[PDB]
Amino acid sequence: PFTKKQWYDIKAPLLFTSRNVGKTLVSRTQGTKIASEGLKHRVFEVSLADLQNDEDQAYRKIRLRAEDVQGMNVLTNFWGMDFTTDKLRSLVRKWQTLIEAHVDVKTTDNYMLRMFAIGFTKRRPNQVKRTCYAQASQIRQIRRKMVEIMVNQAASCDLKELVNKFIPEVIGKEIEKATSSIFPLQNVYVRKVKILKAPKFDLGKLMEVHGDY
């Protein structure tokens, strides 16, 4: 807010559609407060609706991480994908079965991350039962299917494809239709992703997923 500070602009990764993401501040050069080190904010919450210019995906949230500050830009990278409280609170309904699964899969880039999936039983078109529950011996099989599908689509090439299958519902739809032999399982997708560990900066692989700025 002072007469000092510099107006930097963030750069979303090339994987999305729009790279311009707001503006940010930093102390210019005062003493030991280096601008390069001070701009390692490393967390930016966006909606993924702006990054795709489509409004129906506003329920999502993308956590970007500032990796390297260069050329008055910040050059962020993926650091997480979560949900807004609105969608999660809207989904959980009474007279229903909630199934939650989670795994700790690992990618080739040594990006240890944790994935969470959430699912709900679906009533049939001709249903007079007012509850639509499931037996625990069935929800356990659903959870096993969720975990095995998660570790099947993961454990593959770099995270680029992993987020390429996150902004669409590829894991969620695959789990949905791989469990129809047990229950219909409506509204299935990845609740949130937590990055447990990053390998290193690696000094250059970030520029392979960024444009010319």
Partner: protein, 98 residues
Amino acid sequence: TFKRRNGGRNKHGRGHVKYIRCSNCAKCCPKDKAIKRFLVRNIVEQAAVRDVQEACVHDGYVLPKLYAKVHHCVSCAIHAHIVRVRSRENRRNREPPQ
């Protein structure tokens, strides 16, 4: 004199049920006995939605909802008019209003 057949709670076929805390006084009440409600409301009300519509950057932004399950002890529920005292014959009426 037994005022209610179920004793004022909803316990059958079990001996113990964990409690909750009333949202107004923080008094421990059994989960089945507590008066539970689910309130769903707009973040901004009708007087506010008009002024927030044009203030929104894009017209495609649907206004967000908020959902809250609240629990009340009998004293707080009665004092807050969540549930009134009913007549002896109307006490058995478990039908929700409308």
